[PDB]
Subunit: 455 residues, 4 copies
């Protein structure tokens, strides 16, 4: 039962902004809900809901700028887009492998962590089966309220305006229910200035080979940060730029291992979202901060040991640490950046991150400083008045539905948020952890009435 | 679409002798074939085939005598009874876990090798859904040819006689097609005599606690062998009998690690059976012998290191090896067994296995010496004449169907063998390796005509 | 060159209080310094310094109450008592093994972490070679200042009074230089009352089998804490008390893995003590708190996974968590302890550790709540006035020598502290990490003038 | 006590042919024996033995042609050149590290297997301390018998003739005792012809970059073999030649893992040589063949998995195996080699190794086919008559001393063999396994009388 197209001029049941892992999980869960074989009920639905997905990328891609060669998953394959909701689903990773004639070969690796490339292709293979309801090259620029009865004081739909990435004109689609699943934006430090030589990690594979077109040149590249991205870049820079001198700049004293130990990893359990959301604001803030080592500013141990083993080989050859080709500079901060000099190389000034150190001259600076999740704020400007009086923060309910004033907004209308709700739903929110079950829940939250007609 | 019962007096399409892993895989594959949602065709079948399973155990059990505490799988969970044929199947291990509310918890172990206890329960959970077509407590004692036209010279069915394990009387069931999937029998050395104190590994958990009813007594137990069973027993004996002196007797000089390395583990691939069967008799004999380290006379490395680490702790405490509580005696053979003495302890005499050594006095002797797969020979005595002239060895075709004289046996009739066909189908034959796909193939081999009516 | 005895009535060069790992390291370093083959200089010393060690234990023991069966080292064998100072030293772990005829056997384990039992024996084997200068069964009860010229205002020696653990009388020994290396004291929570059923982890192997003399009884034991001790106890309780119900009580939500990753593990490097001591008080407090995961409130990953795997087996058997034989209770605190009831079992009342829960009834309560290092404070009461005016905290210099008023105390006299100086010397201070080099430094700090005569 | 030079015209006590790991171990053991601090006796020796080492390499090198980047040890660091004989020795790996200021850094890797580069440097650091008794650039071309009394029928010394690798003239040195420790020679298949494009693995790093001077060219390289060398080359070829197509040709069906499991690894124990030598010729031949998996035709598991994981990534990208950039061709033999064609590429013809397949066109062919140890045979031609009548095979005694006719050869004279004696001393013979203890034994075997004068 493939999801059939809805003409743009028609009132949709659902419009999802973005078609990343989060949205794909919702589409996969809708497919399954409407599948009469996974749901006995689904036989008596017949009428397919009017759903549309808008993605600003040309096709499906999963962090293309960070697809570093050899890079692995930070999560078991069992936490794919379907399995935890229903292992029977056609969209499980194992069934993807089987459909590729590769399942037996994978088994022989004996790994729960597939290559980031392979997993992208898995999520690519899922994405293609919804190409009839996904409009690519469409960047959403704002969501606007609407009224079936213009004279009334009740909002019952939303107009969603999207700029065409190629042609540039704005098209508009009307829906009763809206989902924003747009992921993170590159978070840059404020002290750093704008320069084509200062590049965020998210754009590593895509915009750096353009700048340093010669993989043979003896460049000077620097990497800011101490999380998974910084490590992956720093480690790759050795391989991709064999004659270049690399420098790792971090305010912390060392890269710290990500926590995946079985007892800690319980916070990521799909069922724990209920128990997390139940907790008081002070207890959520206490939990995220305590469990930070599972997600943020941390590196997979095997890569920490790998980076270290390389560093040790440099010692075997040269006892003088200052003479190494690849160097780590712990407890440092960037204070001054000279990027107006005639040469190719900027001049980075460094100080101790503890309460003047060296100076570096670099052709490029990879800034692996993480992501912000406040992008939806810009999209929901025109809909802010629909919240209760006083609300400057969007408040998402358990089912991820933003709180709105019930006297201003019809119950058939509403906006959902997906990816940013870490403060309320837990650390598993921004990741792949619960997407399968979250997708299942979302389909029920949004199409509950419709699916109950057959149930 | 549950498999409905067939009255014993009716002509069956299929009778499987035994309801172990192999038969369960065939039932699981039939279920799936007849499932209209996994097979589009299955909708237009309607009429269920007349199938029956006969098991001599009271209920489903998977090597109960060897369910040693802590004992693990020798195979990935992906090689379960359904996944490699279809990951969508309801009978996959992951879906079993989901149906138990446990899938998320398993993930957190980060293991491809579940506990032998858990996997039994998985295969128990599969087995229960076919209780309507399985007759337990029924030991098959012979399969006999039959003729629809008694005066003709053509055999077109088989009468299968089974002794009731409890009541004792012989019942008979008629089928066109027969499957023998009865697994291995305990292989004992010829030099050893009959004694209730000499026990085969297969009966370790079941018949040893009866003999040594006191888990506190300072017993003397011995273990013969150097394979996975001997190691598991020997290692358990330390834990189950804390005050007893254990002795490991092996003709080889050391326990050798099982080979599960990715390139070697290709022989177990479901697709390789085709390529194996294609090979000449000399090349099959060359392959099994070369790849032996994957299956026979080998121990999982983690358990070799564990047994060794225990042995090292004995050295830390006592430098005198002869004074250890748990001892390994390499390159030894049992020559004389004195089991007629007044005392509780037999007297085992040992010689060098290389071209007189010690003497041991033991309350029990666990003989972990592997299994034979010639049990079907006894069952198929009365059907031997149905083979082509001269044939003293049963010759199984690729689809596991025994070769019979086509002028004596109707094409609607035939006998299949499952588990013993290692000489022709490979090392994966006796194990769980290919059961999912083998079950799929078997259902097609047996019910090909019937399923094509809807196809 | 064995260390010869000094009669108690004679003025010593050195008296060390305690003969644990720290003191043994100092004796080992003195041996080596005086060894003419490890030190070319040592040939022209001839006159051995007058040194004495006072230990309150009957013989050498390394945490006997926590020698849990199977328990391993938290540190590489290379960080033994000699190797990092000089791998040539006779007192290295590898040379200990060689002297036991066991070095080749150890190699075959392929482990950097020996059993806690074996390592004790290693440090026992080192300790015996200094039995001529160690007085066992001697608990030091106070160190007192003395004056060669009683009428003068200059202190130039110390009288060290020790109670005899057996006979009870106080003996006194005079030395110019004093070392306090007494380790930690059991840290108990204030909310808990005194009861023979409430036992600190340090006394687990020694005082619990006395209380619960029946290893067969269905007891109820509880374990407070979430660090390495709590885990080791909790895990052992399963094995040592097979029929007892165990309960783990922790204010944190989960046991967290100890950090031994190569980059973090740099703080433990012998050379880093210099760089640590150099840092400001705010930066030391920032470092210890940030690196806490390496030492405090953490469990070795393999044991976290082991405890978890056991817990998972309980789920396989019983889905009802409340019915498990061994249970973990996260985010709980003990509020009320009823220990005056007629029965064998106390009644523990539990609340949520976050801003009433269950009630437990237990025969014993193992309190694994860590250690305090303020024991020397009691010993140095009579010497407090020797510090500069105002000083209520003992201030240890880099060489671990407590700051004293130079106008009140002769330069030939001084007190050293060993083990408690984490606040000033780093996280490696209380552990085995730097003992080899620290011992080398201490011998130079104390016998510098004497050893320079030959140098 | 450094080993002082002996003028070439003087009668030596010992001449060792070759200065590889084996000889260095003997020099290290002599140093230690003569060290008055490791041997109490050594003080009363005074007179240093007249020893000389002749090496054909310009300086110390340990398999320079196979120093593949990233390549590791196949053996624990504890099995270095000194530790197992005496961990106190100055020449241990740990003490080498300490002398480099690197011991603490190594610890943090947590590895028993150092990089092949680092270990070479360790053995380089040992080698330099014997530069006064090693004559480099000297290839021994024959050992010749001599008689103090030319008219007598008793041989009591040996003249050892060596060609100068640079200048070319033959120099001669006279010794009473001779050691041949020259290692293996490249073993080539007979079917392959002479071509600068056909290169043995031993010359990989040294003679291949000369042939394929462009690391950018899209070459075709092939690798024959399935042992550790073939794997290391094949895996490196991907990294060193990023645009080249690699092909692995092996007569076996898969690369098999080296056995390092604790129980099997007992055959390598220094003490086991005694027990091995004691065994009958049939039992030695049975042991080597059974334990082959520890040394020959085997690959370290981590590299098998690594090669496999790369191969799997090729499947993810292209399902067509024939289109992969790096390919493995199992069960193949080279039958015809066309190396007279005008092009750069030879034409290799392949057949099935089981009782015509593809054709390959290659710029180079790396032949990793192992080593022969019959090089000493050529050197000892002129001394063959000194054996007992009939002897065409050199028979080495337990102490590695070749059997000679006692009526023809004085007891003060004799020849020792080191490295080739696997047939008599075990699998540990050709490796680093027992060198420390073997060196100790050799020094005692050769300088027994001399060292007993002081003992
Ligand atoms: C390099 C990298 C690797 C990671 N790997 C893992 C891992 O191993 N496992 C794991 O659990 N977590 C991982 N994550 C975390 C990751 O954020 C989530 O796993 C997952 O990608 C979240 O998906 P999402 O749909 O919420 O956000 P995204 O993946 O960012 O998807 C959002 C999509 O919406 C589109 N979009 C954005 N703005 C607009 C707009 N205005 N209009 C229309 N479309 C828009 C974007 O193009 C994007 O395709 C990784 C993150 C990074 C950066
Ligand atoms: C202790 C142990 C653990 C193992 N674990 C693994 C593992 O980790 N993974 C793996 O791949 N391989 C394993 N195996 C190998 C094992 O043989 C197969 O995996 C699998 O059990 C084969 O199933 P089967 O149905 O062919 O034989 P069986 O499992 O023996 O099933 C045959 C059934 O038929 C019944 N039966 C026998 N005779 C008769 C009769 N005359 N009439 C009626 N019924 C009869 C028996 O009661 C039995 O239930 C293990 C073997 C042992 C002994
Ligand atoms: C169970 C356990 C295991 C550990 N294992 C490790 C490990 O794996 N590696 C590691 O690096 N760290 C470990 N540690 C940390 C440990 O504290 C140090 O490694 C080491 O024991 C410190 O030695 P110390 O001499 O400073 O203190 P201690 O080991 O406590 O030695 C002090 C000695 O002085 C004696 N003493 C005390 N008071 C007096 C007195 N008044 N008069 C006379 N004598 C006295 C005591 O009896 C004791 O023998 C462990 C700690 C515990 C509790
Ligand atoms: C690539 C590679 C890696 C290895 N790594 C390991 C390992 O991880 N651990 C391990 O235990 N085993 C390893 N080995 C096995 C190795 O053979 C031994 O460990 C060790 O090198 C044996 O030393 P040797 O002195 O007996 O022989 P060699 O190392 O070959 O030393 C012989 C020396 O004598 C010189 N020589 C030769 N002929 C003459 C002549 N006619 N005149 C004068 N001088 C001559 C040679 O130049 C050479 O330097 C490895 C082998 C190879 C090929
Ligand atoms: N071309 C291969 C033949 C080489 C032969 N098997 C040998 O080892 O001599």
């Amino acid at each position: 039962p493939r999801l059939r197209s809805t003409p743009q001029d028609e009132l949709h049941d659902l419009l999802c902004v973005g078609f990343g892992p989060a949205s794909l999980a919702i589409a996969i869960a809708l497919h399954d809900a409407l599948d009469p074989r996974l749901n006995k009920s689904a036989s008596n639905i017949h009428a397919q809901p009017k759903i549309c997905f808008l993605e600003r990328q040309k096709q499906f891609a999963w962090h293309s700028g960070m697809l570093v060669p050899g890079s692995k998953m930070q999560i078991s394959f069992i936490k794919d887009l379907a399995t935890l909701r229903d292992p029977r689903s056609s969209f499980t990773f194992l069934n993807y492998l089987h459909q590729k004639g590769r399942l037996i070969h994978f088994t022989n690796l004996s790994t729960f962590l597939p290559a980031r490339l392979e997993f992208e292709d898995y999520m690519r293979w899922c994405a293609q089966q919804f190409s009839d309801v996904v409009a690519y090259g469409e960047e959403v620029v704002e969501v606007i309220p609407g009224k079936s009865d213009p004279s009334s004081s009740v909002v019952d739909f939303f107009t969603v305006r999207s700029r065409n990435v190629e042609t540039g004109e704005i098209s508009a689609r009307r829906t009763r229910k809206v989902v924003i699943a747009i992921g993170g934006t590159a978070k840059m430090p404020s002290g750093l200035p704008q320069d084509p030589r200062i590049i965020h990690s998210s754009k590593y594979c895509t915009t750096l080979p353009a700048l340093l077109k010669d993989k043979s040149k003896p460049y000077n590249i620097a990497v800011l940060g101490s999380g998974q991205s910084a490590a992956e870049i720093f480690h790759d820079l050795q391989k991709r730029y064999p004659n270049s001198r690399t420098t790792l700049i971090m305010r912390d004293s060392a890269m710290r291992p990500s926590d995946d130990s079985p007892f800690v990893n319980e916070i990521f359990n799909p069922e724990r979202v209920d128990k997390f959301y139940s907790q008081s604001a002070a207890e959520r803030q206490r939990s995220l901060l305590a469990d930070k080592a599972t997600n943020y500013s941390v590196v997979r141990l095997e890569l920490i040991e790998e980076i270290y083993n390389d560093m040790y080989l440099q010692r075997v050859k040269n006892p003088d640490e200052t003479q190494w080709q690849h160097r780590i500079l712990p407890e440092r901060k960037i204070t001054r950046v000279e990027h107006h000099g005639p040469q190719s190389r900027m001049r980075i000034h460094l100080k101790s991150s503890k309460p003047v150190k060296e100076t570096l001259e670099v052709d490029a600076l990879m800034v692996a400083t993480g992501y912000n999740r406040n992008a939806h704020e810009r999209l929901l400007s025109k809909v802010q008045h629909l919240r209760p009086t006083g609300q400057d923060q969007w408040k998402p309910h358990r089912d991820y539905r933003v709180e709105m004033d019930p006297s201003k907004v019809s119950s058939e209308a509403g906006i959902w948020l997906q990816g940013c709700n870490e403060r309320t739903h837990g650390l598993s929110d921004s990741l792949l952890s619960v997407l399968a079950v979250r997708g299942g829940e979302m389909v029920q939250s949004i199409f509950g009435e419709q699916l109950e007609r057959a149930a």
